[PDB]
Design a protein around this nucleic acid. Structure first.
Lengths: 154, 135, 165, 111
RNA sequence: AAAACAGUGAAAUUGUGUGUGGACCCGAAUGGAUCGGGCCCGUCUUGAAACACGGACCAAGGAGUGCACAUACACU
């Protein structure tokens, strides 16, 4: 069992969730932020363009000292990025929901990403040796993920 | 619940609208989370509140104490007494003009029914009447 | 005695509270308001408050303490018979010679109102009667009929208390 | 439209004034009382004839209450200004606004 | 050295949704622009807002006690 972070009906929606994933937290929420409220086929098309360096992910909260780029103009900012490892995971996750939709008897179209959220999972510890005989931390920061898509009333 | 003490019925609203809503928060409890809101008197050598500079907040003291007649009076015009037994109501039989009863939280459903039945026949006001026993 | 009462109840002898209640009630009692002397039967007055403000009307009687009774002219200006606080009237020096037979009563003209009464106008025998009295005093006089039709307007160029009425 | 009518009714029957300050010293303010100037009143002797009269602040854009009532308590200074009290304290946002003076007296309790 | 119940599950801190503001507190208000007053606490010091020192944040622990010998007071 899992308590999804909001209340939407079981009929007319499809869902997935995963725990402790080993994609990097801060990169993943910048990805999720931009595909919220988007239609599922549009989302999958956009993420394919990011993998090919034809379009970018814009950055707003975890964004200090980031590079400027002409592809960011599509979202009214200068700053953008190409986090390949997070994009491959999210793309797979979304594609599986179209399988579930088809099998459940909704249409493959008119599905819209109504809810999506990322949470921090516990740290995995590591070490690096420094100068003057010191040892310093070198940890890893994984994540948890939820998605719910619904059929447009139209 | 909308009930009032009959001796104060034409006065209760003046009384209620006259009560202060001042709070005496501890100094700098707004600045750091480790200091709670509960009042403590400042005792520093430099402290601006102890030294009573204009613009610092006010400190508690005897001047703010209410008149002896109004003090302890609930907004319905009665004073309260705690009860946990049928044999407790028996005490209020002389005092029901000014006092009302409040059943203690830990008394359970089966017992509360027996308290309320007795309260009806003796003519005593109970302020937690609905309580847990709404279902 | 049972332990609940020997401690809590002890705070106050509450048998004293009636005496406090009386003294408090006395202090917040309203002050009296004076009934005025300056108005005589058949004085013209100007209405200062409520739905009928700005019109001239004729004063008939004192009614119920500060309440007074007035009539418009349903033919001339459309205002019927009504009641109002006697302070909401500005006096003027014209006096008609009307005298009435009996006492009559009507709806009060409250200071706060939500909506205008554009329609639904009818008259009683007494409204008819009183108009058909007032009208006789008005018909014989030069511009008096038109006087009752134009609303009053305060002069915006001089201090009010310099003017006479 | 009732607002347009309620204005014209008031305009025909009242004197006009403007709210300009709370009662204040150089340092402190006393927001329970407000200061008003009346259109053509220009001496303290002239102003004394208004002490006791009703005043109203009408505000049609308000969602809560369309008008606030008050009373003139005292003269202030030597050039014909006055001091007044209202049923609620006047906000600093309401300074500069137009006030109506109502040509009849009321008691301090009525407001 | 650490490590009790496969109970309960606070605060610091994070994400999403909905509201309110541009450091915040006190006094007084609006439909709405805001008005007036306030320098950072603790500590030594003639004198601290200091270009004096200690303090990133939260929980839990954390400092006038026991005995002997004379003593003045209150009570038996």
């Amino acid at each position: 069992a899992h308590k999804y972070s909001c209340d939407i009906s079981e009929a007319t929606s499809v869902r997935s969730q995963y725990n402790n994933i080993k994609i990097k937290f801060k990169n993943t929420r910048e990805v999720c932020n931009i595909i919220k409220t988007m239609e599922l086929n549009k989302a999958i098309a956009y993420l394919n363009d990011v993998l090919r360096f034809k379009k970018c992910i814009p950055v707003f909260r975890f964004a200090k000292k980031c590079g400027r780029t002409p592809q960011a103009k599509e979202f009214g900012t200068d700053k953008g990025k190409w986090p390949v490892k997070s994009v491959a995971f999210v793309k797979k996750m979304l594609e599986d929901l179209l399988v579930e939709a088809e099998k459940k008897g909704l249409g493959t179209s008119e599905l819209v990403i109504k809810h999506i959220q990322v949470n921090q999972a516990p740290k995995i510890y590591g070490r690096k040796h420094g100068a003057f005989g010191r040892i310093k931390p070198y940890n890893k920061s994984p994540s948890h993920i939820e998605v719910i898509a619904v059929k447009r009333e139209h | 619940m909308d009930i009032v003490n009959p001796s104060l019925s034409k006065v209760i609203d003046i009384i209620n609208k006259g009560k202060s809503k001042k709070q005496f928060k501890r100094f700098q409890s707004w600045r750091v989370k480790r200091v709670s809101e509960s009042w403590r008197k400042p005792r520093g050598i430099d402290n601006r509140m102890r030294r009573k500079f204009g613009g610092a907040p006010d400190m508690p003291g005897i001047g703010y104490k209410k008149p002896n007649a109004i003090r302890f009076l609930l907004p319905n015009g009665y004073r309260k007494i705690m009860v946990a037994c049928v044999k407790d109501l028996e005490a209020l039989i002389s005092l029901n003009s000014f006092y009302c009863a409040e059943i203690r939280h830990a008394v359970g459903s089966k017992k509360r029914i027996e308290i309320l039945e007795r309260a009806e026949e003796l003519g005593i006001l109970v302020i937690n009447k609905e309580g847990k026993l709404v279902k | 005695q049972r332990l609940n009462i020997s401690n809590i109840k002890n705070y106050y002898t509450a048998d004293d509270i009636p005496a406090f209640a009386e003294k408090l009630l006395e202090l917040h009692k309203p002050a009296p308001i004076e009934l005025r002397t300056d108005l005589v039967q058949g004085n013209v007055v100007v209405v200062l408050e409520g739905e009928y403000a700005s019109y001239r009307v004729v004063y008939l009687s004192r009614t119920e303490d500060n309440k007074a009774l007035c009539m418009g002219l349903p033919s001339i200006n459309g205002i019927g018979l009504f009641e109002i606080d006697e302070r909401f009237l500005l006096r003027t020096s014209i006096v008609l010679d009307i005298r009435l037979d009996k006492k009559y009563r009507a709806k009060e003209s409250k200071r706060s109102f939500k909506k205008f009464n554009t329609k639904e106008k009818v008259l009683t025998k007494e409204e008819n009667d009183i108009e058909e009295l007032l009208l006789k005093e008005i018909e014989n006089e030069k511009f008096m009929k038109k006087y009752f039709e134009t609303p009053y307007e305060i002069n915006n160029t001089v201090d009010f208390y310099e003017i006479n009425h | 439209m009732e607002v347009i009518k309620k204005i014209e009714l008031k305009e025909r029957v009242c004197a006009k004034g403007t709210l300009y300050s709370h009662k204040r010293s150089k340092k402190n303010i006393y927001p329970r009382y407000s200061l008003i100037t009346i259109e053509n009143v220009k001496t303290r002797e002239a102003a004394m004839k208004y002490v006791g009269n009703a005043v109203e602040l009408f505000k049609p854009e308000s969602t809560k209450e369309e008008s606030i009532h008050g009373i003139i308590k005292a003269v202030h200074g030597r050039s014909g200004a006055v001091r007044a009290k209202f049923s609620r304290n006047i906000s600093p946002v309401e300074m500069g606004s137009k006030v109506y003076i109502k040509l009849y007296k009321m008691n301090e309790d009525e407001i």
